[PDB]
Design a protein around this ligand. Structure first.
Ligand SMILES: CN1C[C@@H](c2ccccc2)CC1=O
Length: 126
């Protein structure tokens, strides 16, 4: 089976709306979400449907852009570095689980290039 998805709602967790977090939604997430290669990353890995029975044996910190999108639109984060870490966890998981040169790795690399381009210009905190 699949594990429960990562948390996207937790009223116990202190929250902020900051200009950096707004940029992560309006620029970073939106740029990657509309990309031709976004679709494998737009929801948690469905290891049943995709016949990857070892996926969650290997990947213990799952992350995906559907979860990130919910976290941003639900104001789940306290700071931008939390969200940046989620993106990097998503990319790292893909490189760890898969083989170099796989289509999915090429897709992650193209998304990560754009990610790096956008967070290079993360605005200074207001
Ligand atoms: C990020 N994902 C999703 C899974 C997948 C979906 C579609 C094509 C190839 C691979 C495995 C993986 O690492």
């Amino acid at each position: 089976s699949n594990p429960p998805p990562p948390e996207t709602s937790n009223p116990n967790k202190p929250k902020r709306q900051t200009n950096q977090l707004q940029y992560l939604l309006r620029v970073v997430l939106k740029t990657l979400w509309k990309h031709q290669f976004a679709w494998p990353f737009q929801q948690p890995v469905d290891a049943v449907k995709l016949n990857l029975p070892d996926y969650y044996k290997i990947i213990k910190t799952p992350m995906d852009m559907g979860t990130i999108k919910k976290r941003l639109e639900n104001n789940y984060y306290w700071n931008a570095q939390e969200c940046i870490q989620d993106f990097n966890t998503m990319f790292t998981n893909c490189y760890i689980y898969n083989k170099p040169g796989d289509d999915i790795v090429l897709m992650a690399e193209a998304l990560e290039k754009l990610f790096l381009q956008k967070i290079n210009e993360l605005p200074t905190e207001e």
